[PDB]
Symmetry: C2
Subunit: 61 residues, 2 copies
């Protein structure tokens, strides 16, 4: 309900609507946010900076 949050979501949607890859990133953001794990994912990224562990997990799904 902060003006910054509402403005950022509008701007992200505008970028997503002109680039499928950014749309995919926005979809990930919305999924992480709805599930309360955005900061948890950022913490994981610090532990796995080159995504070696994450790639293996995503691949064997």
């Amino acid at each position: 309900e902060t003006p910054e949050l509402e403005s950022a979501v509008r701007a992200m949607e505008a970028a997503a609507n002109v680039d499928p890859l950014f749309q995919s990133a926005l979809s990930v953001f919305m999924w992480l946010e709805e599930n309360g794990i955005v900061t948890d994912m950022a913490n994981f990224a610090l532990s796995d900076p080159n995504a070696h562990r994450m790639r293996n997990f995503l691949a064997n799904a």
Copy 2:
């Protein structure tokens, strides 16, 4: 394999930075976006999310990393 350099992208990054100034959610979001893009896993993660909509599998993975 990288975000298209559009005027909308520059505006989105600026807006996310303004939100990161008031909400840690957007600090984390910027870091996650950069990490997904640099590692080439944006689409892979979006595809995973479709299979795990309530994040039960992802939460289990993050809990034990």
